[PDB]
Amino acid sequence: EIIWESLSVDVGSQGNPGIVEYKGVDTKTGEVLFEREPIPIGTNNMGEFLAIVHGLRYLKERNSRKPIYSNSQTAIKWVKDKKAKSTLVRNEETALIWKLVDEAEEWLNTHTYETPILKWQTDKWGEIKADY
RNA sequence: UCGACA
DNA sequence: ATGTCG
Ligand SMILES: [Mg+2]
Ligand SMILES: [Mg+2]
């Protein structure tokens, strides 16, 4: 049932909106494959979205067909739509995350991928392996 | 009016 | 508490 041969991604924050980071781990081993430097202001869902898209890019650049697990129904939908429907205000503090989101959407519109993006089933399996 | 995912 | 979708 759990596809162990996969990349798991999650967001961590302090505040929401607040300081946002995300990371990607090997679901089997728990090895940390990428971790993004904290972004001073963002939302949980923005970070969950950026983590997926970072994973797609990471896997694509490495010619890997592994799926990606996320526990975020929001982010999964945003990635599918190629569109992050965040409510976060736009100002000088949120400019960085909003630039990163814009660039993520732009990646999705300029690349193909066959990577299945799967929902991690927290209720049945416990916390996703990339959890902070 | 909630339900659900975080 | 907030950020999001069904
Ligand atoms: Mg999560
Ligand atoms: Mg989590």
Residue A88 (CA) to nucleotide B5 (C1'), in angstroms, measures: 19
CA distances from A84 to A26, A68, A114 (A): 25, 18, 20
Residues contacting A31, CB < 8 A, separation 6+: A25
Fold of the domain built from segment(s) A1-132: Nucleotidyltransferase; domain 5 (3.30.420)
Q: Which residue is nearest to nucleotide C5 (CA to C1')?
A: A74
As beta bridge partners, residue A10 has A23
* Both structure tokens of A99: 């630039």
What is the Cα–Cα distance from A26 to A34, expressed in whole angstroms?
Answer: 10
Resolution in A for the shown PDB structure? 1.7
Residue A66's SS3 state is coil
* Both structure tokens of A13: 């924050």
- The label of the residue with tokens 């991604």 reads A9
Q: A70 near A76, Cβ under 8 Å?
A: yes
Q: A50 near A40, Cβ under 8 Å?
A: no
* Cβ-based contacts (< 7 Å) between A 26-55 and strand B: 44-45, 48
C-alpha A25: how far from chain center: 11
Closest CA to A9 of A19, A20, A24: A24
* Both structure tokens of A108: 């999705």
Using the CB atom, is residue A117 less than 7 Å from strand C? no
Using the CB atom, is residue A46 less than 7 Å from strand C? yes
For chain A, give every domain's residue range.
1-132
